[PDB]
Each structure stands twice: as C-alpha cells, then as structure tokens.
Amino acid sequence: AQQLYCTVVLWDLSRSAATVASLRAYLRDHTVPGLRQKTWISSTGPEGEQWGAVYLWDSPEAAYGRPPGVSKVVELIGYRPTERRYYSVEAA
Amino acid sequence: QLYCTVVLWDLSRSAATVASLRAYLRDHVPGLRQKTWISSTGPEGEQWGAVYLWDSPEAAYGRPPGVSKVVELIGYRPTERRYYSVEAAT
Amino acid sequence: QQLYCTVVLWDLSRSAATVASLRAYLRDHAVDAYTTVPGLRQKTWISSTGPEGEQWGAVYLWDSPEAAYGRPPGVSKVVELIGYRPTERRYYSVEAATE
C-alpha cells in the first residue's frame, strides 16, 4: 500500500549469443496484481553487456515470487538470471 | 531515453545499520527525474543505497546529489556504483 | 529463579499488515517500557523478513509455569492490526541466561 519492495533481476550476456541490441529489438517488435512498476534496464561497458528488470511491489511476498515476463526473456537469452537482488524502498 | 544510476554502501564496516539510517531518515536538480533510497538486509549483508532516474547520460555520470549527508552518516563513500539505460518503463 | 519462555508468532503473509506497517504503528504508538503483569519479567516484540516469509511475534519471560500457558497478555491491538490470533505458539524453559 505505502511500503514498497524492489526486486532486481539481471543477466550477464557474456555466455549468450543475445546482446543488448537483439533484446532491444525483441522488445520493440514484441497490470500484474501487486506490481506498481516494471522497468527494463541494460548496461554496456568493458565489464560486458547486461540485461535486467526492476520490479516495484506493494507486498513483501510478491518480491520473492517468480518475476513476471522473465520466462520469455529466459528462452531468448538461454539461461536463468545470473543475479537477483531484493530491496526495500525507504524513500521515493 | 532515460538513465538509471544506483549508488550502494555495504554497511558491514560502519556503525550505521539499515535500522539506524531508517530512523535518521524518519527524523530528518537539472536532469533528475526521480530519487529513491533503498536498503537490503539478510544473510548476504546490510546495504543502503540511492537510485536515480536521469534524462541525460551526462547528469547521470555527474556526482550523485543528496549523497553528501549519507556519506557522513555511514563514514565512507559508496562501495558500489552501477549505471543503466532505461529500455522500457510502465 | 526458574523462568519460562513463551513465544507467540503471526505468519503475516495472509494479512494486509506487514513488518513495515506494524513497525510504523509501533513507532507512533509506543508500548509500555515496563512490565505490568504480575509474574511477567519481560516482554519483547520481534519480527523476521526474507524468503521464509514475514513474521511478527512476542516473547514472554515468566516466573511461573501456569502463566506461560495462558492467553498471552497485551496482544489485543496487534491482533486487531493483523486480523487474527497467533498462528504459532512455542513454550520453552530457560536453562541458563547471562546477566
């Protein structure tokens, strides 16, 4: 309701033929209960390419649920997310 | 086209905890769309952080605003910085 | 000398209440700093979070074994905030405690 909970899900794309470009295109071509906000993010650098999603939830349980719209990205990239983090929103 | 920067502190080396920073917070800029404080607890360790939403990559690379006070509260600069392009948002 | 520890817990997953919201209410409505109930040495509110699931609870230190098994005192407001009675009760003997 007022306290929000954040889940961050990240894929390192070093071990995948998918890139930020290819995944941006699949997003271009191709309302969940409890979910206030869903954001797709990316990063490029010497470290390598990364794809991810940031979820704002209105309940603590949902934050640990299987993240929505991840199954489709899993088969596109080739594997389970390399990183997953859990936060509380303290002030926005 | 928006950009997202996140600044984090591992709190294990500070007297500060998520709880004490939360309490302090409770009792107390060009290009910047949104500023959000975040925290993390559990077996992996305590963290405090700020998430910024920018509309330019320059401002995003600029030194994070409103971080000065927190650096004083924790006792050191952020231990981790990450930089993202926003691809899509609801 | 012999003390008895009763722990009552609420699983919060079925409730609109959360650790954050219970903690916020507590912050704006301070509980008694001292014990009122005869035989009650100490009362502590506790919480847990993370993948296991959210929980709220009360830990009681009693000087008699009868009270340890009675209805736990001072939980009426929390029961109203959560919307149900404790989902779990545990009974312990204190075998040794540091001072």
Residue numbers in the entry:
A (entry chain C): 6 to 35, 42 to 103
B (entry chain B): 8 to 35, 43 to 104
C (entry chain A): 7 to 105
From the article:
Thiopeptides are a class of sulfur-rich, highly modified peptide antibiotics that are active against various drug-resistant bacterial pathogens. In contrast, the amino group of the terminal amide moiety in nosiheptide is endogenous and derives from an extended Ser residue of the precursor peptide34. Dehydration of this residue at the early stage in the nosiheptide biosynthetic pathway generates enamide, and subsequent dealkylation requires the activity of NosA, which has recently been characterized as a new terminal amide synthase, leading to a Cα-N bond cleavage for nosiheptide maturation with release of the co-product pyruvate. In conclusion, we characterized three key elements (basic lysine, acidic glutamic acid and flexible C-terminal loop) for the terminal amide formation in nosiheptide-represented thiopeptide biosynthesis, these mechanistic studies on how NosA works present an intriguing paradigm about how NosA family members function during thiopeptide biosynthesis.
We thus overexpressed NosA1-111 variant and its Se-Met form, and purified them to homogeneity for crystallization. The three-dimensional (3D) structure of NosA1-111 was determined using the single-wavelength anomalous-dispersion (SAD) method. Three monomers occupy one asymmetric unit, two of them form a dimer. Each monomer is identical to the others with an RMSD value of 0.21 Å for the backbone Cα atoms in the secondary structural regions, consisting of four anti-parallel β-sheets (β1, β2, β3, and β4), three α-helices (α1, α2 and α3) and six loops (L1, L2, L3, L4, L5 and L6), which are arranged in the order of β1- L1- α1- L2- β2- L3- β3- L4- α2- L5- α3- L6- β4. The first six or fewer residues at the N-terminus are invisible in all monomers, and the residues from 35 to 42 are also invisible in the two monomers that form a dimer conformation. This dimeric structure adopts a global fold, resembling an elliptic β-barrel of 28.9 Å in height, with diameters of 15 Å and 23 Å. The β-barrel is formed through several hydrogen bonds between the residues of the β4 strand in one monomer and the β2’ strand in another monomer, including hydrogen bonds between the E101 carboxyl and S53’ –OH group or R29’ imide group, between the S99 backbone carboxyl and the S53’ backbone nitrogen, and between the S99 backbone nitrogen and the S53’ carboxyl; and a hydrogen bond between the Y97 backbone oxygen and the S54’ side-chain –OH group. The β-barrel is also stabilized by salt bridge within the β-barrel between the side chains of the R96 and E94’ residues. However, the enzymatic assay performed on the HPLC system indicates that NosA1-111 has no catalytic activity, revealing that the C-terminal loop NosA112-151 is extremely important to the catalytic reaction.
